[PDB]
Paper text:
Here, we present a high-resolution application of SPA to electron crystallography data, using cryo-EM movies of the prokaryotic, cyclic-nucleotide modulated potassium channel MloK1. Each of the four MloK1 monomers forming the pore has a transmembrane domain (TMD), a voltage sensor domain (VSD), and a soluble cyclic-nucleotide binding domain (CNBD), which lies in the intracellular side. The total molecular weight of the tetramer is 160 kDa. Furthermore, we identified different conformations of MloK1 tetramers within the disordered 2D crystals by means of single-particle classification.
Although the 2D crystal images processed did not diffract beyond 10 Å, we improved the resolution of the MloK1 3D map to 4.0 Å. The overall resolution of the map improved from 4.5 to 4.0 Å using our single-particle approach. The map's resolution is better in the xy membrane plane than it is along the z axis. The refined map contains nine full MloK1 tetramers. Even though the missing cone effect is still present, and images of tilted samples are generally of lower quality than of non-tilted samples, the application of SPA algorithms to the MloK1 dataset ameliorated the overall resolution by accounting for local variations in the tilt geometries along the distorted 2D crystals, thus offering a higher diversity of views for the 3D reconstruction. Our highest resolution structure, derived from the consensus map, is in general agreement with our previously published model. However, we here show that the previously determined structure was an average of several coexisting conformations. The procedure allows retrieving high-resolution information from disordered and non-flat 2D crystals, as illustrated by the 4 Å consensus model presented.
Residue numbers in the entry:
A (entry chain D), B (entry chain C), C (entry chain B), D (entry chain A): 1 to 355
């Protein structure tokens, strides 16, 4: 609610091409298909093959920034991106060679930041996942066994064994309920009353494990990435130690590209920003072009009024952002700073039109 | 638990009429229907058509409050509300013209506050939704492919391709489980054990994304809307800076209309209010009619007793509200204020009967 | 994790008898049933009828504590508990009179505390439930209409109308997936990809609405019920104002009945209690029988050792409870109090054996 | 995200053998099976039988640490682990004796820490589970009855009774939706609109009950287990009282075994540790082998640089761990401590190569 995400977060074309590339599989997988487009998309594999391959050797030019680096992850797919289709072409002479479109699926995961953020937390909380998983194994066979006791008599063909009744556990416990084999007697139907009750409590915890410290990590990602963009601000020599931990939870940083709009005039004032690197276009008769280490919006937050200038991203600006409360928090946190923002709430009134 | 929502939160009849209006579709959509009510409800479309149309030109009288406004949203439907049925009437001569009852569906969304509250947060957290969505695309085809490996042999008609096995992914991953095509072999049945386990972890995060900062925003909505109704209170010149941020999270403001009841006598005392605009009917022999900027309930919270007066909303009062703890928080937060509320807990005892 | 709930929380037999009473329905509802038990359980209705009826007039003796009371809820069922079966007996001569076992279902809800706790919060947050519910009505027909566009041609008998396709929305949107009518074409199958994605986000919020402030209320229930049992403690004249709000979130009060066990000797020490009313049996050679306004467990928490005495509930004690951290919080919160608890950690060592 | 879990958290072979042991059931449960492996796995039961039996008498040697102990749980299965198969062998002469592989299922639960953590909280919050469970019983039969009113006429064979319509409640309310018996009329189909809406709100609370204070307990488990490893640190005589409660929520302790790696050189610096018992291998020309009560990582966190030494677990070290923010919290929490960590950020620069 308090950020301007721009400049193509889904930027690199290395990620883009797996999307059209993998859909090239399906037409090959289908009978009664004309040979025209059958082979036309096979080229598109060769294109993406050639495309990454063109990228590839430029990636294997890893003399860029070569001081100390850990690029086993980022290289691990680019290598196999072209080898696996290549060796696939010859040994697998039949058209099944295309079934190695399991390979590009890591290419999104190659440059998928937020995926290492995922795997980071599992190596702390998997202590719980296992005891829950074992417990899920407890509750599975503890329950899957209870049915073989009963309907093996009149349902041999469906419940004439245990693992057939392990199927009907997770189908019945994991909220799904296909509808292939269902009991007939009374007692087997009684048992389900706790099953759904159980699995919705298990997953009521187990899925809870993920979002639990995940949110800690994503809420943490807004700090580790943003203890930077702190010292750059010329004013923040006076902020107390504990003051910052209160604040940085809310301040998210994103970048706007050149030419784009930051805050349009007349739209309702609801937030203020801290420019820290780049430049803007404060649309006034004398443009107050504020560069690295500036801010604007207090003119709108103190009064609660529309925007006083169409600020456009004249360049690629690394932006911060902040709504009222957490700035009202700051104005409440210290009178020493509200003074200059009161002054600035008068200076920028005349300094917007003047120089 | 601590608010009196009244005066028709679902007020404007512009929103009301889409409900009966859209149900007018269904009778037209059905064979063997008598022509009587077939056309009778077609009028009701003309009524709502005419009704908004009567409203429409009064809306196009947008000279009201015409200083600086952004009414592209609020107008965008009212225009199409009547044009699209109109042009539908002529070109689409067959009864299918009624299928443009897809149009009024925005009319609730026209004046649906809390809908902009929804879209506000997606433009900050969609950084995550995409990486999760791609990851959902990873896990889909990573898994949907695993089955074509197997049952293409003995299930051509069901699993004789990939996208047929992409159907059976989300059906199987998204908790649903229709029951159209299910495996027969063992290994294809093993794979599902992680699928439901997976999708309930994916959605265990992904649905978590929504409620995560949504609640931040709704809990924030109780501040941005309620840093107002602060300075109006004559007593709040003494409240410290950090005192308020602690409080306003709990104080929600709503309005009661004239004539309605606010707190009835004898009911158990559980909360106190701050009147800030309007007037009441404190039902006493001398009615202590307290207008803008008052409060009552401390007589019940300090003692823990029933209500001392049937307070009725004599006018349309913009109300606040507060339970004990967060007022016990205030009484604990400062002795300076509990003095006057102790005094007021004696003054209003005699001042309730007297003037 | 930090409380001893005892003395029959499911106490009153008024609540108990609906459980056996309603199961008396089913045998009447079944063909080929012998008349023996058919009428035998009809008596049990007369028993519960007579049982509450015996209770009833004693309830209508509402001269007990008759000062100011609001007993429209608690009476509203007891009246109908016996009238509705009575009038059912005569006018409904056929056995369908038993179908008024819809009536006792409120009797649990009669004395179901925690049910008013439920309805309390809906009257503050239903502002959201409606906009979400309308939004659910938006997303229903916005989506349910998209299918009639398509399969009306080759699925008249299943999708030959709109509301048939409204059925297949919530079945498909609300995680359920029966398996009655499913598409055949491609495009109708594409649409479901966002449906489950959508409904799991809708309910990802909407069910979130309930648990959101519900937990605020239940976490609040541990305060409003426990600002009592504060002043009774002889030591709590020194506790600062803000000290208490930190504490009472954790302190839950429950009651133990006479004769029961409170802490058995030798079990691992993990918590301490505050006795405020009643008496105990501190099993020592000289029983240190501590009555209203006492505590014990610091002997185990400071050392981290087993229990030093088999404390048994000699009488019905209104108990509090507290684990280490929130007491380590207290020991950390003030040196003034840890002194007496250090002294008490020596006094009760010798005073346990002596008098 | 901030811990190094190592040394075989799933360690004891008592837990390990139930996994292969129980799968020995299934081959016996199947017709047309060759007798070779039929009896081969029956030995494996005898192995695990003998294996625990070998363990058993060594467990019944409970003269180890025999001062005051409560080992009814840990013994309760080991006894039955071998008796129940034994008596099963003789009385149950037919192969059904193997159906007492319901017995080993507690053996994981024997040494499943985190399982007592589960049952601990239910004895405080089951006050809610019951009122919700009764409420679930309210909503079940309140709704399951509504359908017998309707389709008993034209669906006798499916809805010719009540409990058949109690089946179709939880199937329909608990998110599952098998697809055995579904209505035909309109009104019975209307009713489901609130059912899924209801059950997803019920479980929206009820599953919420579990994760609610569960997370309190697991977040508490990181304190009760970690008020230890506090006094061992030589520096923590100066930490204020309230300072610790802020910190210990984040500090989790785990153990690394001998020979393993702790932080490899060159990997990105993201965390620091407190060694409290054991020894390391700080891979430098002069190995700065720091034993019980040390720390490292400030060299990387103050600068934000890679690791300055391949620290390997030379012995079994009981480790703590800490990311930046909560250490930046500490550096912000006190200048008195950042001094020595500034000094240490210079001492260990030269003391890493020197002695
Ligand atoms: K389902
Ligand atoms: K199904």
């Amino acid at each position: 609610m308090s950020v301007l995400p721009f400049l193509r977060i889904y930027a690199p074309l290395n990620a883009v091409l797996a999307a059209p590339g993998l859909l090239a599989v399906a037409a090959l997988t289908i009978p009664d298909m004309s040979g025209r487009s059958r082979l036309a998309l096979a080229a598109l594999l060769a294109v993406i093959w050639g495309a990454y391959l063109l990228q590839l050797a430029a990636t294997l030019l890893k003399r860029r920034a070569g001081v100390v680096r850990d690029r086993t992850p980022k290289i691990a797919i680019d290598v196999l991106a072209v080898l696996v289709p290549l060796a696939a072409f010859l040994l697998d002479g039949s058209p099944d060679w295309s079934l190695y479109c399991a390979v590009w699926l890591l290419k999104p995961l190659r440059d998928s930041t937020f995926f290492p953020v995922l795997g980071r937390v599992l190596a702390n909380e998997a202590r719980n996942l296992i005891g829950v998983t074992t417990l899920f194994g407890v509750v599975l066979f503890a329950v899957a066994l209870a049915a073989y006791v009963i309907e093996r008599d009149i349902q041999p063909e469906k419940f004439g064994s245990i693992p057939q009744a392990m199927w009907w556990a997770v189908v019945t416990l994991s909220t799904t309920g296909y509808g292939d084999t269902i009991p007939q007697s009374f007692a087997g139907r009684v048992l389900a009353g706790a099953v759904m009750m159980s699995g919705i409590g298990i997953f009521g915890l187990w899925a809870g494990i993920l979002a639990t410290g995940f949110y800690q990590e994503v809420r943490r990602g807004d700090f580790v990435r943003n203890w930077q963009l702190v010292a750059a601000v010329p004013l923040f020599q006076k902020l107390g130690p504990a003051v910052l931990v209160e604040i940085v939870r809310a301040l998210r940083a994103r970048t706007v590209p050149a030419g784009a709009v930051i805050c349009r005039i007349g739209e309702p004032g609801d937030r203020m920003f801290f420019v820290v690197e780049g430049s803007v276009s404060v649309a006034t008769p004398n443009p107050v072009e504020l560069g690295p280490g500036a801010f604007f919006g207090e003119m709108a937050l103190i009064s609660g009024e529309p925007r006083s200038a169409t600020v456009s991203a004249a360049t690629t600006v690394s932006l911060l952002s902040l709504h009222s409360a957490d700035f009202q928090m700051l104005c409440s946190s210290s009178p020493e700073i509200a003074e200059i923002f009161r002054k600035t709430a008068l200076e920028r009134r005349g300094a917007a039109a003047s120089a």
